[PDB]
């Protein structure tokens, strides 16, 4: 074990970013957001610690699908009761709780570990152009093509 840097608390500094979902595609936004949340954009990335920044998504109702995903692309869940399977379409979920849509899409791109859950707790997603987190002084972030 020669020299390789290993970030820890007392080394790492987390920031606050704001991303506008208007006119954007769901998965193509969510991949980049997951990368930000996990810290792949940082040179001090270490996987056994939560290097990574905070992210704010604002509009979330102008999010766009392609094709007929509005009526196809059904989300399922199960209550662990018999015949307790339930369904809902993506357009329905967009006009009703569009924040859950994006947050679940991003938590699906994050891993299902303890650190992954902590990293997904750093995602604040809203409906509409206003957010409360002005005290944290967030910077606007433009997505890469």
């Amino acid at each position: 074990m020669r020299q390789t840097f290993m970030a820890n608390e007392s080394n790492i500094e987390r920031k606050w970013y704001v991303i506008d979902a208007e006119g954007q595609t769901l998965g193509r936004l969510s991949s980049e957001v997951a990368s930000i949340l996990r810290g792949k954009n940082k040179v001090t990335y270490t996987p056994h610690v939560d290097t990574g920044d905070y992210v704010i998504v604002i509009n979330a109702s102008k999010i766009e699908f392609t094709g007929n995903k509005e009526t196809d692309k059904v989300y399922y869940r199960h209550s662990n009761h018999p015949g307790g399977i339930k369904s809902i379409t993506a357009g329905e979920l967009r006009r009703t709780n569009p924040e859950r849509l994006i947050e679940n899409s991003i938590k699906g791109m994050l891993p299902s570990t303890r650190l992954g859950e902590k990293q997904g707790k750093k995602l604040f997603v809203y409906g509409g152009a206003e957010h409360p987190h002005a005290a944290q002084q967030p910077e606007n972030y433009e997505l890469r093509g």
């Binding site: 390789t4 954009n41 040179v43």
Partner: protein, 116 residues
Amino acid sequence: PRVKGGTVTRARRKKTIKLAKGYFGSKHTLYKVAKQQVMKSGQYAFRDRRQRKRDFRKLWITRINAAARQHEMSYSRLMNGLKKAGIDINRKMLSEIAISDEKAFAQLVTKAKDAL
């Protein structure tokens, strides 16, 4: 003449028990399941000594990609430029330079760019 099984069984088992220090419950008290774990432990260590190198190269490459995308460049094109410019420098040393002295990393990113 007769020879009885004295002290060698006990020594042989005891040093395995001692190798099994820190294990959960019966796996630091009982010879059979302790021995079973120590063997497994050595096999795991044999393969992990080799997984280590892969994992660390993976880490260095991730860091270099991050450092390059700040200068609007991918890992792939950066390393092609380095190879063409002659640089025979490790990914590890690259990562450490990118963390410590960003200026030098920019300075050789310029060379990677102008070699294309």
